């Protein structure tokens, strides 16, 4: 199917507690594969998935050089943004960056991304054309001018259409037994009375990968969007994910309710009901 690579950078200032922390993690789809943390006893790029371990010394050294350099440039950038917003030196602030490439089911580039935020708000993003920028405010317009002057977009475009896709393809092949395996959800419906007159039906999906899934309840074949309690999809810790959806129904009316499950790993979409 479709696949993506992303790097996520977080740079956090902490006045009075040393220099800003820089952390980078890399993902293919829902699988992390590398980390770097400037706070580590010996900051270096470390593998986080077995299929990346086969990369040579030059790969690790090159990654580490890049993240060490970013640690320094992001510290300068934090200073710069503090100034752009006329902020005092007393507060802690965060720059986040997420970038990478998306491939379609044929393996060709679907689109690229290079997005930044400041204190959790959109700051600047590379447009889908990979040639122009969208700045959130007049501070970000200053970054935009700097990046335009330095032809940054042209360099991101080269990476996103080139190395990004090339490496993602390599990782997909090297990790094909996991990265290209969809594990379908194991499902069941539970029943718990909440009173004499109502009961909870909870539809469970466990052990699935990737995280993308759709869980809905219908009553008489009609979507119950407003009445359904849906927890956020959550990691199990073994690569797989979990989710449930719950509905409170009148006792006696249980068979009017159906749980529907869509997941990439499913030969056919599931329809489930409570089985007393």
């Amino acid at each position: 199917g479709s696949h993506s690579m992303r790097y996520f950078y977080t740079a956090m200032s902490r006045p009075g507690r040393g220099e800003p922390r820089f952390i980078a993690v890399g993902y293919v789809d829902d699988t992390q594969f590398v980390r770097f943390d400037s706070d580590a006893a010996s900051p270096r790029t470390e593998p986080r998935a077995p299929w990346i371990e086969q990369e040579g010394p030059e790969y690790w050294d090159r990654n580490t050089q890049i993240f060490k350099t970013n640690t320094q440039t992001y510290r300068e950038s934090l200073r710069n943004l503090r100034g752009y917003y006329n902020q005092s030196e007393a507060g802690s602030h965060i720059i986040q960056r997420m970038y990478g490439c998306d491939l379609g089911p044929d393996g060709r580039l679907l689109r690229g991304h290079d997005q930044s935020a400041y204190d959790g708000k959109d700051y600047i993003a590379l447009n889908e054309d990979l040639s122009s920028w969208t700045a959130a405010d007049t501070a970000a317009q200053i970054t935009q001018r700097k990046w335009e002057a330095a032809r940054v977009a042209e360099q991101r475009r080269a990476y996103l259409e080139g190395l990004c896709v090339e490496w993602l393809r390599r990782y997909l092949e090297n990790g094909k037994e996991t990265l290209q395996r969809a594990d379908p959800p194991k499902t069941h419906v539970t029943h718990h009375p909440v009173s004499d007159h109502e009961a909870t039906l909870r539809c469970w999906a466990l052990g699935f990968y990737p995280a993308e899934i759709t869980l809905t309840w219908q009553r008489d074949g009609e979507d119950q969007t407003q009445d359904t309690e849906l927890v956020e999809t959550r990691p199990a810790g073994d690569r797989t994910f979990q989710k449930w959806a719950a509905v409170v129904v009148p006792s006696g009316e249980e068979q009017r309710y159906t749980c529907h499950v869509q997941h990439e790993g499913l030969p056919k979409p599931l329809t489930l009901r409570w089985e007393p």
Partner: peptide
């Protein structure tokens, strides 16, 4: 593999 930068890249 992550992307590189020109020297002295900054926001």
């Amino acid at each position: 593999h992550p992307v590189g930068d020109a020297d002295y890249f900054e926001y």
